[PDB]
Design a protein around this ligand. Structure first.
Ligand SMILES: *[C@@H]1O[C@H](CO)[C@@H](O)[C@H](O)[C@H]1NC(C)=O
Lengths: 103, 58, 221, 97
């Protein structure tokens, strides 16, 4: 979804990306609620990966809140939009060979 | 030396393979309207190697 | 009967076929690729000579397929060996009939690979180079994510912002003002602004031919 | 030019072949236009071209006095040419002669 946008984007297309962005961050909030209920927060702070999830999800949420206002028309701080892509590192840790090589 | 020649020779073929491929693709297609400043071209094989080696060194 | 063909391989004729690969390799460097359908006198001979090399290799496939089995012969390093023969015959067959006819000739640049396959003293060193490539996949994988993570970030920040270049104010001609166009951001935005006698109008002259900007995602990689 | 040389019978054999695509064609067209600019109104001229076949860039097909007007026609025809085909000097020179 983050790779879909391109210059000269369609107003309808822009909305669709935002809709998915709202949806996807919603699922990653289910990851939050579902995980934290499984075991209390004190264990959530134990591993950095779970800690790294704190700032990522909230960063996404505040961006959605900032989406309520419309400085532009479908005829500004853009620092929290990068937290979505940065979560991809969690995928990198899956590989047993690479993580030990980097670690 | 019996192995350095083999290794360097093997490297030479790779440059030849891509140099020959470059001619088949970009051979004579660098003739643009602008003033001919395209010295690093793919026109003829002896001059194609220099262009390929230039990419290798980057 | 088939035994007669097999015993030929015993006779050291691998020298002549290998020299044909080298001989052909010298027949590709001489080929001058003129810009637009032109061809000097020599290029006319090489295409005729190209037929000979095709026949010499084609007969060998028959000699080496009957002797070593149709199924087993591909199951070796010769897979590319037959790969050239199959598609090269298409090239000569299709060209004589008359698009992509000319571009299909690129497969012939692979024949030199047969040269490194023929000599067993060089197949080992090539496998030595390749055998060392497996560990580097992890480095390749990391570089793949470095490209992806940074390319996506590039999209968000530099989302096609290099499409405003300075234009002359006189208005006789609508062309970029500076002989070396550089992206400009007009007032109300951070960046450079034109000189006393030119304006930054939203055309497109920032990147060189629109190849080195962050517009698309492919352009971002 | 009036005293430098006597009248002429020009015949410019523009080589519009595949090998002259790009800058070379621009130089050819500019040089041919300049040459036609260096012809008096009392000498004849024509502009042929060979690309494995010697056609004529213009509508004349013979020598046309290099007048103030004919020069313009030849200049426009030269400007609107393209590189293509295979060069053939023999056929072009035969056509010219
Ligand atoms: C240029 O010459 C070509 C020759 O076929 C012709 O089709 C074209 O209309 C000409 N253009 C002009 C502007 O004279």
């Amino acid at each position: 979804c983050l790779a879909m946008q391109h210059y000269g984007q369609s107003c309808l297309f822009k909305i669709a990306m935002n809709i998915l962005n709202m949806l996807f961050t919603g699922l990653f909030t289910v990851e939050m609620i579902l995980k934290l209920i499984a075991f209390k927060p004190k264990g959530y702070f134990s591993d950095p990966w779970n800690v790294f999830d704190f700032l990522i999800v909230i960063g996404s949420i505040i961006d959605v809140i900032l989406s309520e206002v419309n400085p532009a028309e479908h005829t500004s701080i853009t620092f929290f939009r990068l937290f979505r892509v940065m979560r991809l590192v969690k995928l990198l840790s899956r590989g047993e060979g690479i993580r030990t090589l980097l670690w | 030396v019996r192995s350095i020649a083999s290794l360097l020779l093997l490297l030479f073929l790779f440059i030849i393979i891509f140099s020959l491929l470059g001619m088949q693709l970009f051979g004579g297609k660098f003739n643009f309207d602008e003033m001919q400043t395209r010295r690093s071209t793919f026109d003829n094989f002896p001059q194609s190697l220099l262009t390929v080696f230039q990419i290798l060194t980057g | 009967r088939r035994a007669c063909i097999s015993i030929v391989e015993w006779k050291p004729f691998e020298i002549i076929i290998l020299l044909t690969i080298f001989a052909n390799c010298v027949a590709l460097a001489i080929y001058i690729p003129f810009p637009e359908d032109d061809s000097n006198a020599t290029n006319s001979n090489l295409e005729r000579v190209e037929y000979l090399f095709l026949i010499i290799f084609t007969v060998e496939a028959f000699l080496k397929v009957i002797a070593y089995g149709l199924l087993f012969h591909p199951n070796a390093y010769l897979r590319n060996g037959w790969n050239l023969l199959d598609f090269i015959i298409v090239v000569v067959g299709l060209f004589s009939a008359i698009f992509d006819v000319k571009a299909l000739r690129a497969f012939r640049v692979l024949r030199p690979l047969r040269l490194v396959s023929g000599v067993p003293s060089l197949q080992v060193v090539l496998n030595s180079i390749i055998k060392a490539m497996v560990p580097l996949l992890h480095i390749a994988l990391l570089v793949l994510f470095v490209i992806i993570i940074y390319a996506i970030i590039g999209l968000e920040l530099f989302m096609g912002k290099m499409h405003k270049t300075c234009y002359n104010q006189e208005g006789i001609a609508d062309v970029p003002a500076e002989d070396d166009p550089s992206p400009c951001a007009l007032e109300t935005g951070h960046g450079r602004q034109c000189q006393n006698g030119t304006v930054c109008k939203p055309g497109w002259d920032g990147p060189k031919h629109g190849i080195t900007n962050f517009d698309n995602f492919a352009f971002a990689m | 030019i009036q005293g430098a040389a006597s009248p002429k019978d020009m015949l410019i054999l523009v080589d519009v072949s595949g090998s002259v695509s790009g800058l070379t064609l621009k130089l050819i067209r500019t040089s041919v236009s300049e040459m036609l600019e260096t012809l008096s109104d009392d000498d004849f001229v024509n502009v042929a071209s060979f690309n494995s076949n010697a056609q004529d860039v213009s509508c004349f097909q013979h020598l046309v006095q290099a007048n103030v007007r004919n020069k313009k026609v030849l200049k426009d025809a030269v400007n609107n040419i393209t590189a293509k085909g295979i060069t053939d000097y023999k056929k072009g020179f035969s056509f010219a002669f």
